[PDB]
């Protein structure tokens, strides 16, 4: 129950010719940019509170340690968003983004909507490197602004570093995004009615994208509760290690798993995006 590269290529091409394919890009898409972890950044900020960096990492997950900065030392949480903006959007990360085959193969296609969950600017900046125009959508003021219909709309699903109050990084902020009331969430509610999604750069043990995968399936079934049940467009999830139990769970959430070649991570994602063209 797992597609290969050559099997999924005519399936993705059929969704793209009629304009109904939306990429949903994760943290693994920014892997060739050699960015800092963030868990390494939050551990070095804990030295001022008396923590050793390996000892502060012991006390919980990354969003739980950021919860601790949000309530006990709020000036260090703003310091964390500050030095991620210097690191994730540095000039060295732009130079790797110029030569990355993943970001070139993404920008070679005329997308209409691109979703991403990472905070850096390298999804839009890939489109600017190809001479294309992109519109960042993170806050209410971004949706209200005018733009042309030719422009690909890049929705920052968890905020952008240039609008620091849109960042979803604290554990309490992840829990209140489960109600789906943010402006990126309301845009997702209308796009799942018409489109198929291509999830790239996630792991099966994320537990946040798994709730989104569940909740998208529940909103598709709820949208056809009184009418006869019609078949929906199939979503996709590109993986390098699919496993043996998790692809069967994802079938019932309207998502087919695509096994990519695990020898070179960045090349096999680039061959997937070039087979859509």
């Amino acid at each position: 129950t797992t597609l290969t590269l050559s099997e999924a290529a005519p399936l993705l091409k059929k969704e793209f010719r009629e304009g109904r394919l939306i990429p949903f890009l994760g943290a693994g898409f920014s892997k060739p940019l050699k960015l800092p972890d963030g868990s390494q950044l939050i551990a070095s900020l804990a030295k001022t509170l008396g923590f050793e960096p390996e000892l502060f990492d012991m006390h919980g997950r990354f969003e739980q340690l950021a919860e601790f900065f949000a309530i006990s030392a709020p000036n260090r949480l703003q310091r964390l968003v500050y030095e991620m903006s210097l690191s994730f959007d540095s000039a060295e990360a732009e130079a790797l983004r110029e030569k990355s085959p993943m970001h070139r193969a993404l920008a070679a296609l005329d997308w209409r909507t691109i979703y991403t969950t990472n905070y850096d600017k390298h999804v839009e900046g890939a489109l600017r490197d190809a001479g294309k125009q992109a519109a960042v959508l993170a806050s209410f003021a971004d949706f209200q602004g005018p733009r042309a219909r030719d422009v690909c709309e890049v929705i920052k699903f968890h905020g952008t570093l240039d609008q620091p109050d849109t960042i979803v990084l604290t554990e309490s902020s992840y829990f209140q995004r489960m109600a789906l009331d943010a402006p990126p969430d309301q845009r997702l509610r209308a796009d799942l009615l018409a489109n198929s999604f291509l999830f790239i750069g996630y792991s099966f043990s994320d537990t946040n994208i798994r709730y989104i995968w569940y909740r998208m399936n529940q909103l598709r079934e709820q949208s056809q509760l009184g009418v006869k049940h019609s078949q929906a467009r199939r979503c996709f999830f590109a993986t390098h290690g699919a496993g043996l139990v998790q692809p069967d769970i994802l079938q019932q959430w309207n998502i087919d798993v695509i096994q990519l070649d695990p020898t070179d991570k960045s090349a096999s994602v680039a061959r997937l995006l070039e087979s859509i063209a």
């Binding site: 290969t4 590269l5 390098h240 290690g241 699919a242 496993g243 043996l244 070649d261 695990p262 020898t263």
Partner: protein, 180 residues
């Protein structure tokens, strides 16, 4: 595209594998770093690397581990090939008494598709050399002489070693069972 993926971290174990199974179109190669279990028993270690390596790569994986059991050391080094190599490179031919030299070199493969593990074990009986002799091998190949020869593993060529080493008979068994 491959079906089975061989996970290794040693750069010389990879070069000997690709001399034998390099032409097979259905064997891939991965270099994921997995946390090595430390135990004396080879059957225990190779069976625990396959769980630890399947968690890392999530594809049908093949792992490998070696052993060197010396009668003078009562089975040591054993599968603890890591902590002795980081302490006694080839000075291990000095720390054992010169009267009794006999030992066995042992190797083990384990392939895991996710549902079940299968362990292959070969073994070569030999005796440890008085001094380190040779360059062409890995981890104890200059100080191990098989039974019958006068010549160590690292003094042999690559074709001569794989007709005596435990890892040479395993790779022929791995070809016929997995159909590589």
């Amino acid at each position: 595209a491959p079906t089975w993926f061989y996970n290794t971290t040693n750069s010389e174990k990879l070069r000997e594998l690709q001399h034998v199974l390099g032409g097979s179109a259905k064997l891939g190669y991965l270099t994921a770093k997995v946390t090595e279990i430390l135990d004396v028993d080879l059957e225990t270690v190779i069976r625990a690397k396959a769980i630890a390596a399947y968690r890392a790569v999530r594809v049908p994986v093949i792992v490998e581990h070696g052993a060197l059991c010396i009668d003078a050391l009562n089975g040591l080094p054993g599968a603890l090939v890591k902590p002795f190599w980081e302490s006694l490179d080839t000075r291990l031919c000095e720390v054992i008494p010169a009267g009794q030299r006999t030992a066995r070199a042992r190797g083990a493969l384990c392939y895991c598709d996710g549902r079940e593990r299968h362990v292959l074990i070969e073994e070569t009986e030999g005796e440890i050399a008085p001094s380190a002799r040779g360059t062409g091998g890995f981890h104890w190949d200059p100080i191990f002489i098989p039974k019958g020869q006068t010549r160590t593993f690292a003094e042999m060529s690559l074709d001569e070693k794989l007709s005596f080493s435990p890892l040479g008979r395993l790779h022929t068994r791995l070809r016929t069972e997995l159909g590589l």
